[PDB]
Amino acid sequence: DNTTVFTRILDRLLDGYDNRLRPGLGERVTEVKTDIFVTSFGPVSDHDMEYTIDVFFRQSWKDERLKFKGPMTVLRLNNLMASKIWTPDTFFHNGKKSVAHNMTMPNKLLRITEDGTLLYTMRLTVRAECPMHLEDFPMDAHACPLKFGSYAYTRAEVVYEWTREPARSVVVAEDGSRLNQYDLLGQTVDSGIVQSSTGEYVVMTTHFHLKRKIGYFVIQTYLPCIMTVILSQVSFWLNRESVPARTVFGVTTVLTMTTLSISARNSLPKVAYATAMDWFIAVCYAFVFSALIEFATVNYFTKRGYAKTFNSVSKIDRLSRIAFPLLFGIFNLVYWATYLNR
Amino acid sequence: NITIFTRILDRLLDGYDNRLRPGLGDSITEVFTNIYVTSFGPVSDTDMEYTIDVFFRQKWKDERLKFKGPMNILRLNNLMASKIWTPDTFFHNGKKSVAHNMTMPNKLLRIQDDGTLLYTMRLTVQAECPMHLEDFPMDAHSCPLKFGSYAYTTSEVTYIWTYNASDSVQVAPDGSRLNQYDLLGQSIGKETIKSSTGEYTVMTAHFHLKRKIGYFVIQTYLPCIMTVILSQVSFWLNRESVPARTVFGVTTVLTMTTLSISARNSLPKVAYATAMDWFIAVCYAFVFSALIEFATVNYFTKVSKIDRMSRIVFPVLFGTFNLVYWATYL
Amino acid sequence: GDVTVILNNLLEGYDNKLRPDIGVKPTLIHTDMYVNSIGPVNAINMEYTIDIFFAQTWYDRRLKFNSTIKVLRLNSNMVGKIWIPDTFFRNSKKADAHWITTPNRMLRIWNDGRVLYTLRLTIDAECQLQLHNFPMDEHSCPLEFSSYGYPREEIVYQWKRSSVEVGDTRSWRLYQFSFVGLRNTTEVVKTTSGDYVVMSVYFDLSRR
Amino acid sequence: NIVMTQSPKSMSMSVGERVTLSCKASEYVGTYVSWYQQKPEQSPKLLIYGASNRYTGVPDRFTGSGSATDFTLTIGSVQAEDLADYHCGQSYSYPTFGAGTKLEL
Amino acid sequence: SNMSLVKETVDRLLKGYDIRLRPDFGGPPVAVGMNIDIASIDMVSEVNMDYTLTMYFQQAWRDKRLSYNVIPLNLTLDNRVADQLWVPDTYFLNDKKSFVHGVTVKNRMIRLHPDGTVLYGLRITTTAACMMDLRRYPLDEQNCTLEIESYGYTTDDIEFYWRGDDNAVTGVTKIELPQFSIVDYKLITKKVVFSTGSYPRLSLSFKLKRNIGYFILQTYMPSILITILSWVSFWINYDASAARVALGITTVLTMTTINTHLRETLPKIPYVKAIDMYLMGCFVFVFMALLEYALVNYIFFGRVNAIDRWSRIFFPVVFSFFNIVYWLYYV
Amino acid sequence: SNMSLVKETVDRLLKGYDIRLRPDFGGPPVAVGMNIDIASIDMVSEVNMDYTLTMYFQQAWRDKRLSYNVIPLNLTLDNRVADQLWVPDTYFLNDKKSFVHGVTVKNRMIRLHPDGTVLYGLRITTTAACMMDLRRYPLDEQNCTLEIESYGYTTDDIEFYWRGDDNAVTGVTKIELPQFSIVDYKLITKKVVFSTGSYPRLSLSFKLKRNIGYFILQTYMPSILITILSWVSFWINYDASAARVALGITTVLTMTTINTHLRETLPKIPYVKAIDMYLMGCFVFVFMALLEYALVNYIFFVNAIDRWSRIFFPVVFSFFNIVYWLYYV
Amino acid sequence: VQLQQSGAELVKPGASVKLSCTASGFNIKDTYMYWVKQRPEQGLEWIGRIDPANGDTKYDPKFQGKATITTDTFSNTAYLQLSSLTSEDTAVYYCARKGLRWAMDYWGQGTSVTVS
Ligand SMILES: *[C@@H]1O[C@H](CO)[C@@H](O[C@@H]2O[C@H](CO)[C@@H](O[C@@H]3O[C@H](CO[C@H]4O[C@H](CO)[C@@H](O)[C@H](O[C@H]5O[C@H](CO)[C@@H](O)[C@H](O)[C@@H]5O)[C@@H]4O)[C@@H](O)[C@H](O[C@H]4O[C@H](CO)[C@@H](O)[C@H](O)[C@@H]4O[C@H]4O[C@H](CO)[C@@H](O)[C@H](O)[C@@H]4O)[C@@H]3O)[C@H](O)[C@H]2NC(C)=O)[C@H](O)[C@H]1NC(C)=O
Ligand SMILES: CCCCCCCC/C=C/CCCCCCCC(=O)O[C@@H](COC(=O)CCCCCCCCCCCCCCC)COP(=O)([O-])OCC[N+](C)(C)C
Ligand SMILES: CCCCCCCC/C=C\CCCCCCCC(=O)O[C@@H](COC(=O)CCCCCCCCCCCCCCC)COP(=O)([O-])OCC[N+](C)(C)C
Ligand SMILES: CCCCCCCC(=O)OC[C@H](COP(=O)(O)O[C@@H]1[C@H](O)[C@H](O)[C@@H](OP(=O)(O)O)[C@H](OP(=O)(O)O)[C@H]1O)OC(=O)CCCCCCC
Ligand SMILES: *[C@@H]1O[C@H](CO)[C@@H](O[C@@H]2O[C@H](CO)[C@@H](O[C@@H]3O[C@H](CO)[C@@H](O)[C@H](O)[C@@H]3O)[C@H](O)[C@H]2NC(C)=O)[C@H](O)[C@H]1NC(C)=O
Ligand SMILES: *[C@@H]1O[C@H](CO)[C@@H](O)[C@H](O)[C@H]1NC(C)=O
């Protein structure tokens, strides 16, 4: 009738069809052409060393048993046909928890052409491992990978290819950036062979080059250390006899610095080494705690309890009014040129 | 050669009606129940619930699953459990239970030659525990576990324990994921519940817990004693040293009020006062009266005899309170 | 042998896609609720948890049998093989039935066609907390349920005269609240797909 | 574009020793280079695909090697019948080619 | 005998009904109209950059295989036939996690009209993504969308429109957000082009303007009163070192602590917000007051009643001048 | 055709099959060999008392019903034929939450070698319960295990063993956790006895030593320096009560905070941790430093005991530090 | 498995020449078809790209405009169009099949064009 001509085409395609066997099981290798359309590169979790990515993962392969001759060259079908045909067992090697979306229907695509060439697109949100080396935190850059390949079929059975040029086979969408801490610099693909206990498997790598934007850790920690050190520098311009004022000055600057040291290591994991921000934290601790030792030396070397023989201005404070701000100022030009410039 | 037990298994399911129950119009169906607690999990005070991993065994006699052949027992796959009559046992005070499904559904099914059936399944029950937090943290919670049928009444399905009544809720010795409590023992129970739809048997089993006090001596009690002693340093200073004894007064009030908010932060927003806020409020009373004493000294300054009479009484009036509070509860 | 041929006679020529009396009259459903324990009334999420035994009573003349057995007490296996009304709770943020160790559902069929379906539900409902006079405030939280697809001309809900019965109100997890009272209510809503009979249960609570 | 800068122009050694080539990439080509031979009056034939993958019919003496940017092709005991010209390509982007390395006696 | 007639009508309806083929598979793009009844908007969250929507998503189209001419009733069937009938493959692009409620049954409606109109509606709770621009936080407006697209059928296979074209979305007036306020919503229809084809897209956008109550009773007024507290140090005699040093230090310490408490409740954005600009200007004013005292102490002891006398009003006048410029650049 | 052969062969194997009965049902027990390729260990937590482990869990047995003397090639079949064949009901006793990954399809492998062998593999992310003794926290070594067991089949039916001995678990050393270091892993085969029979059990265990860098950087070194500001009190004339009492209270309250800071993150254990003896040990030296001022403000209202203290207080802490460090390392 | 090209061409400069190669043993709809230029005593220069299943073409920016690539399905043949021939276009041309891992597997025998 009207759609009976296509019904007897689909029922002829699926008659005597075994979806347990790959196309050309005993005669050839089932090549799979792959491209990824990244619709949103999601947030990167520093604490869990992971990242999120929403894709339009496409696979294409040739099936010799799905050839038809009809009034339509392409059969743009729904997803019930996809479960009744052979589809490759592509899985993500460094994935942690991925979701194939199915609201309101399963987000899949299936387009058989008249010679058997298939196209299989899916919506996935892949949470993948991005191992990080945070020795230059927060002025660091990472290359978060995304490896995928077959699970059961080895290199002699199913090989994977990019359908376009490899520089153009991973396309990130224009608005596809849910990144608020990093910014994506560019994608980078590679293809290789990985060996396991079962056999050798073709793996397709996609590296996403990320760079952290220091916009937050300035206002958050760097500038409170600068204001805490420059705060603890003006205690030398106070009176020599003023013991409670400079005493509470030193102890409150030490408390603000030692609570900056605690809050500094949050939302990044408990790594064994020390970051660049931790070295900065150590120096803005040293240049606060060295002021109070100077004040203790002055208080040991001071005399009468008023400001008759009046007291004299300390020589220790006059050098510390000049040496301590410049030894801070030389350090910041050394620290920021070492890490931020390279 | 496998073929033989295939035809006996096909014969035992040829005419079985999972909808009907063993002896529907004839007699009762007794479901002997065992529980093997592999790990009594953590108890949550905020959510008024506890976690428990069991091996929920059940046994019952269906005389349609009787067979006569080579074998005597048949360990069939847990998929012969989705096509036979299993009891509809649910946990009455449960909140969210899961039957584990890795790498297969965790279920054990054995049919005895006489038609008996052993049905074990691994669960993780998150049952409700009603807690009276009025002796906190010296309280003891007998968190129970009630289970019974849902659709079958006492005239159709009755529950019994398998062995002797004490020897039923077996608890694995090493497996105990309690960090707050210690399991003193468990007590079983067999009742009959009357609900608008009929009467049903409710097999109840209580686990008697008791809270280990060692966290709260360290976290809240000793940091409350130390700041009463810290507030009593102000009586040993100079009369004329007013900016020093001011700072002991303000900070000891502030470090007590911060400890007061922390105390209740370990329990639900209940209306009744626990027996831990009654320690801090008395400890807040000694800290505040230290400031009133210094304010009384500051009114009569121009060594004070009132200062020396607070150097003895307040250390030993706080001492007698610890000999009353930590003698009644503990 | 006698009960299974009764059930096999009931299920043959049966369409669960159609409500009973599809082109004759609306299906009168007598609902009933037994509250197990009202859970914590979260305010920062404006919500409350409730655990009930939701009961429903209607008539299906296709499920009519003559025999000595007067009542067919059955399990949840036969739930999906008969027509069950599409009752949903209109202000439930997320909720679920209970499945351990079996689906917690009841099904009893009388010889005239009385279909009693009772299931166990845990519902996070929604009640906008009057955010004034806090903490000396008092609240009324609703539980509105209705059919989804069947309008007033196809499913009519009627409250049974044994509508609500709190269990104990003693082990209830209402810590800062106290259960004052309740009132079973019903009304008809006008949506974009028809007119629906909506039944609300207002649970009265006051802060202690 | 991607610029292939293979060096040197020509190598003049005898038969029976190890000889290596080199191909430097301007930008990243990741194991997507290829090596072809060019006999006089002959179409090119593929030798290595990927970075170091021996094509069918290639003898075992032809061993390539690859990286992210630096590439090389090592020949072990080169014979007289291998006296041809060698080309280096890439296909990570639109394909380019090198100048060409020849062999001499 | 209505039961047998409806039974035999529904029987024939799916006798060969091909689930795999769309209506007019080789014919014109089926026209699918959309109705959305918003029930609530739950958590417009900035830390995760998403909002939670609960709607009654309704889809209406014509299938001429599902046509009956014997019954003058709009047949509402059980929702288990919806897995036997062709439904469109409508998905939401900015969706992150969604579900269709299932208490007491799957919450889904199916209704066959006598011309073939298939009324297919669902109750869906979506946690849709909404990337926010927090350059003006908290005095700012947010535009949150929902991108309703087909997945596998192109513009020549399926066709989307809003049923009514202005009243397709009801219930948005009733929605009450605690920290926000819905000002406007628009219904935009367009076609998007990918590498696999061109697909019809309906987009439902909201405009969320933030309320300025909790921010002015938590963030602005404590910072303003704390900057008032630093000006008590201007009136004290210079020899009181401990009082003025302790007041300036505690004012510096309070400002820092409150900016921390406020920054960790937000995602780690690399730009500066307006609340961060205000809490930086307040910190600059407090630091200038403390350095004013330090200058007074230096100019007395190291090297005096005029600096605190002219600065006593200088800071206020400029702090009010900063407040007029700040609240006029925004608002 | 050749695919015609590979079908008529599979359609002949799995027809007449009984998935309800194990191989050699009335005969000897079936031996199931196991080998695991750990792929990662994610979140070793102490609050939840558990560790999350992602593995490539392979199993191997022999079924005589799946023997094909036709094709000279091992047959890898779609993951969906696993539901049509008998697989062992292997479970983990200390499991809390687990899932086989299902993107883009279900992550499982089944391969049928011609003799009858079946290579059945799965990619599973288990959150396994591991009870931790936090008495020596954070200088501790917790021993976390994975209790592989059969559920329904006893030792008279199922046999569990490691394939290739200690070469069966791989990829363990490559795992590099942020707060721990994998010191050793051991493989144990044993039989546990329950009420309903004796069951085979393979035990896979790990030894995880905890690093100390993060704690020196967060908990140890700030507490040490909050004690030194305390030491500074002896460098101020007692006449400056406000200055001295200020130091005393600041570091006393700061010490109490440092102690209460790291306690709501850790679980409510009843015993006392090795980090807490340092935080109590520094608390006493902080508390006695303020009471050192309380004695001299009582005697006068001097330097003899003041200088005595500036000499002993940094030494007694050093001597305390000595034994603490010795014992805990 | 065999790529057979046309014969040698000799045309005057400024004219146009049609150049072709027929692919046998497979179908050109699967793999990409590449064109390449080999000047005498020089290296290879890639001409352009064509996807016969799609019709999409991509060209070298130095070869844009003066050369275009066409194809057909029935004859299984790829074609070259050259316009405004000069002295530097005197070279030999090959058509390349895209092979395993984008490697230019098969090559034609080579058509050499000459101007005068
Ligand atoms: C997108 O994809 C996902 C993944 O496929 C879909 O979600 C799944 O949907 C399937 C099919 O409905 C579910 O399987 C069914 O599960 C029923 C039991 O559910 C409970 O356990 C499962 C775990 O097994 C949980 O996931 C469920 O939780 C979910 O559902 C509840 C509903 O209240 C929600 O509240 C939760 O938030 C979750 O969303 C539950 O805890 C099970 O009953 C059902 O099997 C019955 O029916 C089949 C078919 O007729 C029978 O073969 C079978 O024997 C069962 O029949 C018995 O039980 C029924 C009562 O249920 C009786 O009436 C019968 O007479 C008989 O006794 C089936 O196995 C799957 O669990 C679910 N999982 C998740 C993660 O949601 C989405 O729906 C899909 N959505 C879209 C938009 O495409
Ligand atoms: C800010 C930080 C401050 C740090 C300070 C550091 C320096 C000073 C600190 C020193 C002590 C530090 C370690 C001990 C603390 C924990 C105690 C403990 O674990 O023992 C037990 C609790 O035992 C009690 O409940 C005893 C009663 C309370 C004691 C409080 C102090 C003394 C009372 C006088 C107060 C007034 C004095 C003044 C009067 C004016 C624990 O037992 P269990 O686990 O429940 O049961 C075991 C069962 N099991 C065998 C089966 C396993
Ligand atoms: C506690 C309250 C304090 C309040 C203070 C208020 C007043 C303070 C006023 C103004 C400052 C605060 C407002 C601006 C903050 C954001 C700036 C920023 O991130 O800029 C940029 C980076 O920035 C850098 O890279 C910073 C470099 C180091 C600067 C260190 C301080 C100065 C050095 C001397 C220290 C010693 C001085 C003393 C010596 C004796 C933004 O770039 P990005 O986003 O990271 O990258 C984008 C990359 N992309 C283009 C490819 C996409
Ligand atoms: C919480 C406490 C509430 C207390 C409420 C009640 C408080 C109350 O009424 O105090 C009044 C008085 C204050 O005595 P206090 O020691 O503070 O004041 C000194 C006292 O008056 C001396 O007699 C004065 O010496 P002098 O002869 O003038 O030279 C001396 O002056 P000077 O030497 O500097 O010149 C004063 O400083 O205290 C009592 O009588 C004992 C109180 C015992 C209180 C109970 C003890 C158990
Ligand atoms: C971590 O802890 C576990 C248990 O707490 C330790 O496992 C134990 O290891 C020993 C030696 O490998 C086992 O002894 C062996 O028992 C088998 C079974 O009969 C026997 O064949 C051997 O000859 C030997 O006697 C012991 O049973 C085992 N304990 C348990 C409960 O399985 C493990 O060594 C610890 N360390 C590490 C690094 O894993
Ligand atoms: C519920 O409402 C119905 C109808 O108004 C009434 O008949 C019944 O008594 C009510 N039940 C209550 C309030 O308990």
Query: How would DSSP label each residue in E300-322?
Result: III--TTHHHHHHHHHHHHHHHH
Tell me the torsion sign for CA atoms D47, D52, D55, D61. Answer: positive
Sheet arrangement for strand G44-50: G9-10, G111-114, G92-97, G33-38, G44-50, G57-59
In three-state secondary structure terms, B90 is strand
Q: How many CB pairs under 8 A join B and F?
A: 161
Query: What is d(CA E203, CA E188) in angstroms, rounded to the nearest whole number?
Result: 5
CB atoms within 10 A of CB E184: 12
In three-state secondary structure terms, G105 is coil
Q: A279: annotated binding-site residue?
A: no
Considering the domain B3-212 in this protein, what is its CATH number?
A: 2.70.170.10
- Tokens representing residue B192 in the block: 């009959």
Contact A38, A177 (CB under 8 A): no
**Backbone phi and psi for residue F15, each to the nearest 5 degrees, phi listed first:** -100, 140
Query: What is d(CA E151, CA E92) in angstroms, rounded to the nearest whole number?
Result: 9
Spatial CA neighbour of B299 closest among B251, B242, B233: B242
CB atoms within 10 A of CB D100: 18
CB atoms within 10 A of CB B164: 7
Spatial CA neighbour of A187 closest among A169, A208, A213, A215: A208
Q: Which residues contact F57 (CB under 8 A, 6 or more apart)?
A: B103, F34, F36, F121, F122, F123, F124
Chain region(s) in chain F for CATH 2.70.170.10:
2-210
Among all chains, which residue has been given the structure tokens 């206020």? E316
* Topology of the domain comprising E2-209: Acetylcholine Binding Protein; Chain: A, (2.70.170)
Spatial CA neighbour of E266 closest among E84, E57, E45, E89: E45
Spatial CA neighbour of A290 closest among A229, A226, A227, A225: A229
Chain C residue whose CA is closest to E59 = C193
Gap between the terminal Cα atoms of chain E:
69
Residue E115 contacts A where some CB pair is shorter than 8 Å: no
Contact F130, F144 (CB under 8 A): yes
Contact F145, F18 (CB under 8 A): no
**Backbone phi and psi for residue A332, each to the nearest 5 degrees, phi listed first:** -70, -35
Query: What is d(CA A112, CA A63) in angstroms, rounded to the nearest whole number?
Result: 9
For chains G and A, tell me whether 3 or more CB atom pairs sit within 8 A of each other: yes
Q: E196: annotated binding-site residue?
A: yes
Best residue among C156, C159, C161 to mutate for probing ligand 6's pocket (most ligand atoms within 8 Å of CB) is: C159
Contact B48 C173 (CB under 8 A): yes
Q: Which residues contact F12 (CB under 8 A, 6 or more apart)?
A: none
Q: Which residues contact C158 (CB under 8 A, 6 or more apart)?
A: C28, C29, C30, C31, C186
Q: What does the DSSP assignment read for B212-274?
A: -THHHIIIIIHHHHHHHHHHTTGGGS-SS-HHHHHHHHHHHHHHHHHHHHHHHTTS---SSPP
Spatial CA neighbour of F254 closest among A111, C77, A261, C147: A261
Query: What is d(CA F38, CA F128) in angstroms, rounded to the nearest whole number?
Result: 14
Contact A188, A36 (CB under 8 A): no
Query: What is d(CA A213, CA F105) in angstroms, rounded to the nearest whole number?
Result: 37
Tell which of G31, G57, G98, G101 to mutate to test the D interface (max D CBs under 10 Å).
Answer: G101
Q: Based on C-alpha coordinates, what's the Rg of chain D?
A: 13
Query: What is d(CA B153, CA B149) in angstroms, rounded to the nearest whole number?
Result: 7
The amino acid present at E254, given as its one-letter code, is T
Considering the domain A4-212 in this protein, what is its CATH number?
A: 2.70.170.10
CB atoms within 10 A of CB B268: 16
Query: What is d(CA F89, CA B78) in angstroms, rounded to the nearest whole number?
Result: 9
Q: Please tell me what DSSP assigns to residue B151.
A: S
CA–centroid distance for E28 within its chain = 37
**Residue A103 in contact with ligand 1 by CB distance below 6 A:** yes
Residues F227/F229/F235/F240 CA torsion (nearest 10 deg): -120
Spatial CA neighbour of A49 closest among A151, A133, A115: A133
**Residue C79 in contact with ligand 1 by CB distance below 6 A:** yes
Q: Is B4 left (phi over 0), alpha (psi -120 to 50) or beta?
A: alpha
Query: What is d(CA A296, CA A285) in angstroms, rounded to the nearest whole number?
Result: 17
Contact F237, F300 (CB under 8 A): no
Atom of ligand 6 nearest to the CA of C185: 2
* H/E run at residue G66: none
Query: What is d(CA C197, CA C186) in angstroms, rounded to the nearest whole number?
Result: 7
Looking at D1-105, which runs of residues are DSSP E strands?
Answer: 10-12, 19-20, 23-24, 33-38, 45-49, 53-54, 62-65, 70-75, 85-90, 96-97, 102-104
CB atoms within 10 A of CB D32: 28
Spatial CA neighbour of F249 closest among F293, F297, F211: F293
Exposure on the CB side of residue E279, measured as CA atoms within 13 A? 30
Longest Cα–Cα distance of chain A, Å, equals 121
| Burial grade of F103 (CB within 10 A; 0-12, 13-18, 19 or more) | buried
Q: Please tell me what DSSP assigns to residue E220.
A: I
Tell which of F109, F123, F195, F287 to mutate to test the B interface (max B CBs under 10 Å).
Answer: F195
Please give the tally of structural domains in chain G: 1
Q: Is G101 left (phi over 0), alpha (psi -120 to 50) or beta?
A: left
In three-state secondary structure terms, G36 is strand
- Tokens representing residue D77 in the block: 């005991």
Q: How far is the CA of A11 from the centre of ligand 4 (A)?
A: 108
Contact E260, A220 (CB under 8 A): no
Gap between the terminal Cα atoms of chain G:
35
**Backbone phi and psi for residue E206, each to the nearest 5 degrees, phi listed first:** -120, 155
Chain region(s) in chain E for CATH 1.20.58.390:
214-329
Beta bridge partners of A170: A36
Contacts of E174 in chain C (CB under 8 A): none
Spatial CA neighbour of A24 closest among F81, E115, F3: F3
Among all chains, which residue has been given the structure tokens 């019974």? B148
Chain region(s) in chain B for CATH 1.20.58.390:
215-328
Query: In chain C, what are the domains?
Result: 2-207 (2.70.170.10)
Residue A166 contacts G where some CB pair is shorter than 8 Å: yes
Q: Which residues contact G101 (CB under 8 A, 6 or more apart)?
A: A161, A191, D32, D49, D50, D53
**Backbone phi and psi for residue A250, each to the nearest 5 degrees, phi listed first:** -65, -45
Q: Which residues contact B296 (CB under 8 A, 6 or more apart)?
A: B306
Contacts of G30 in chain A (CB under 8 A): 62
- Domain containing G94 equals 2-115
- Tokens representing residue A284 in the block: 């803005």
Cis peptide before B137 (omega within 30 of 0): yes
- Tokens representing residue A137 in the block: 């935190």
What CATH class has B215-328?
Answer: mainly alpha
Gap between the terminal Cα atoms of chain C:
59
Contact B76 F20 (CB under 8 A): yes
Query: What is d(CA B73, CA E174) in angstroms, rounded to the nearest whole number?
Result: 65
Cis peptide before D8 (omega within 30 of 0): yes
Contact G102 A115 (CB under 8 A): no
Query: What is d(CA B247, CA A244) in angstroms, rounded to the nearest whole number?
Result: 13
Query: What is d(CA E85, CA E83) in angstroms, rounded to the nearest whole number?
Result: 6
**Backbone phi and psi for residue A333, each to the nearest 5 degrees, phi listed first:** -70, -25
- Tokens representing residue F163 in the block: 């394939």
Query: What is d(CA A226, CA A34) in angstroms, rounded to the nearest whole number?
Result: 51
In three-state secondary structure terms, B282 is helix
Exposure on the CB side of residue A67, measured as CA atoms within 13 A? 6
Query: In chain D, what are the domains?
Result: 4-103 (2.60.40.10)
Question: What's the Cα-to-Cα distance from A287 to each of B166, E295, F52, rounded to whole Å?
Answer: 69, 22, 42
Query: What is d(CA B238, CA B252) in angstroms, rounded to the nearest whole number?
Result: 19
CATH number where G104 lies: 2.60.40.10
The amino acid present at F44, given as its one-letter code, is V
Spatial CA neighbour of E65 closest among E5, E19, E34, E4: E19
Contact C17 E77 (CB under 8 A): yes
Contact C17 E81 (CB under 8 A): yes
Considering the domain F2-210 in this protein, what is its CATH number?
A: 2.70.170.10
- Residues with CB under 6 Å of ligand 3 are A 183, 213-215, 218-219, 222-224, 226-227, 325, 328-329, 332, 336, 340; E 256, 270, 272, 280, 283-284
Best residue among C33, C35, C164, C184 to mutate for probing ligand 6's pocket (most ligand atoms within 8 Å of CB) is: C184
Exposure on the CB side of residue A341, measured as CA atoms within 13 A? 7
Residue D100 contacts G where some CB pair is shorter than 8 Å: yes
The amino acid present at E314, given as its one-letter code, is F
Spatial CA neighbour of B266 closest among B308, B313, B315, B211: B211
Query: What is d(CA E166, CA E184) in angstroms, rounded to the nearest whole number?
Result: 13
Q: Which residues contact A107 (CB under 8 A, 6 or more apart)?
A: A100, A101, A122, A123, E89, E91, E151
| Burial grade of E328 (CB within 10 A; 0-12, 13-18, 19 or more) | exposed
Contact B91, B203 (CB under 8 A): no
Q: Which residues contact C67 (CB under 8 A, 6 or more apart)?
A: C2, C6, C111
Question: What's the Cα-to-Cα distance from A298 to each of A242, A318, B62, B294, rounded to whole Å?
Answer: 11, 11, 94, 33
- Tokens representing residue F35 in the block: 């080998």
Considering the domain A216-339 in this protein, what is its CATH number?
A: 1.20.58.390
- Tokens representing residue A274 in the block: 């020390």
* Topology of the domain comprising E214-329: Methane Monooxygenase Hydroxylase; Chain G, domain 1 (1.20.58)
- Tokens representing residue E78 in the block: 């059980």
Spatial CA neighbour of B113 closest among B66, B63, B60: B66
For chains C and E, tell me whether 3 or more CB atom pairs sit within 8 A of each other: yes
Q: F256: annotated binding-site residue?
A: no
- Tokens representing residue D23 in the block: 């191909």
* H/E run at residue B308: helix B305-308
Chain A residue whose CA is closest to G49 = A165
Contact B53, B123 (CB under 8 A): yes
Query: What is d(CA F122, CA F107) in angstroms, rounded to the nearest whole number?
Result: 6
* Topology of the domain comprising F213-328: Methane Monooxygenase Hydroxylase; Chain G, domain 1 (1.20.58)
Pairing outcome for strands G92-97 and G33-38: antiparallel
Q: Based on C-alpha coordinates, what's the Rg of chain A?
A: 32
Contact C86, C18 (CB under 8 A): no
Query: What is d(CA E107, CA C149) in angstroms, rounded to the nearest whole number?
Result: 9
Beta bridge partners of F146: F204
3-state SS track over chain A: CCCHHHHHHHHHHCCCCCCCCCCCCCCCCEEEEEEEEEEEEEEEECCCCEEEEEECCEEECECCCCCCCCCCCEEEECCCCCCCCCCCCEEECCEEEEEECCCECCCEEEEEECCCECCEEECEEEEEECCCCCCCCCCCEEEEEEEEEECCCCCCCEEEEECCCCCCCEEECCCCECCCCEEEEEEEEEEEEEECCCCEEEEEEEEEEEEECCHHHHHHHHHHHHHHHHHHHHHHHCCCCCHHHHHHHHHHHHHHHHHHHHHHCCCCCCCCCCCHHHHHHHHHHHHHHHHHHHHHHHHHCCCCCCCCCCCCCCHHHHHHCCHHHHHHHHHHHHHHHHHCCC
Contact G57, G49 (CB under 8 A): yes
Spatial CA neighbour of A197 closest among E312, F37, E76, E142: F37
Query: What is d(CA B33, CA B147) in angstroms, rounded to the nearest whole number?
Result: 10
The amino acid present at B30, given as its one-letter code, is E
